[PDB]
């Protein structure tokens, strides 16, 4: 059983026996390749004080399933729509939070609409920039880069 220390906007903090638990809405992330470039985004993230390289990602809000949330954040963050395929999911850090991320591939991208910086970048270059200390990754950004190298070359 959980006792709640804080009920917030995008998280709750609970204690469960000796365990500190952060409840958090699920998330989605979209991997998209065009002309050899992957679709990254960057935004200032106050939790870390910097703008890591991410792929388009967002929270699943009331009413939505993961596919719908993925289509929405792709459009809102980048102005694009595409044909989305579910790939896999992961718990971001299951030792303390229940946040689960559902990852999609987007193909056949179309601009549907003309704080978030869109960064098209070859994944090989993202990985080299990271290795040289020039940019940080989020989990979603790293998953995109690794998925590309595994399956999209």
Ligand X SMILES: Nc1ncnc2c1ncn2[C@@H]1O[C@H](COP(=O)(O)OP(=O)(O)OC[C@H]2O[C@H](O)[C@H](O)[C@@H]2O)[C@@H](O)[C@H]1O
Q: Establish if 112 lies at the interface with a copy of itself (CB under 8 A).
A: no
- Surface-to-core class of residue 66, CB atoms within 10 Å of its CB (0-12 exposed, 13-18 middle, 19+ buried): buried
Closest CB to a copy of itself among residues 27, 121: 27
Neighbouring residues of 7: CB distance < 8 A, sequence distance ≥ 6: none
Q: Which does 152 bind (CB under 5 to 8 A by kind): a copy of itself, ligand X, none?
A: none
Q: Establish if 7 lies at the interface with a copy of itself (CB under 8 A).
A: no
Residues in the chain that come right before a backbone break, where C and next N are over 2.5 Å apart: 114
DSSP type of residue 50: B
Q: Which does 4 bind (CB under 5 to 8 A by kind): ligand X, a copy of itself, none?
A: none
Residue from 32, 42, 55, 58 in contact with ligand X (CB under 6 A)? 58
151 in helix, strand or coil?
Answer: helix
User: Under rule CB under 8 A, which residues in 37-56 are in contact with a copy of itself?
Assistant: 45-48, 52, 54
Query: What is the distance of C-alpha 89 from the center of its chain?
Result: 11
**Interacting residues toward a copy of itself by CB under 8 A:** 5-6, 8-11, 13, 16-22, 24, 27, 45-48, 52, 54, 88-101, 127, 130-131, 136-139, 141-143, 146-147, 149-151
């Amino acid at each position: 059983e959980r006792t709640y220390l804080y009920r917030g906007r995008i998280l709750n903090l609970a204690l469960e026996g000796r365990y500190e638990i952060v409840e958090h809405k699920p998330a989605v992330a979209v991997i998209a390749l065009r002309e050899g470039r992957m679709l990254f985004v960057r935004q200032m993230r106050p939790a870390v004080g910097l703008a890591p390289l991410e792929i388009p990602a967002g929270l699943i809000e009331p009413g939505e399933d993961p596919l719908e949330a993925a289509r929405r954040e792709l459009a809102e963050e980048t102005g694009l729509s595409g044909d989305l395929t579910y790939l896999f999911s992961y718990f971001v850090s299951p030792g303390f939070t229940d946040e689960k991320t559902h990852v999609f591939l987007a193909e056949n991208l179309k601009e549907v609409e003309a704080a978030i910086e869109v960064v098209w970048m070859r994944p090989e270059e993202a990985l080299e920039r990271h290795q040289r200390g020039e940019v940080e990754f989020s989990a979603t950004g790293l998953v995109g880069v690794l998925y590309y190298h595994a399956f999209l070359r």
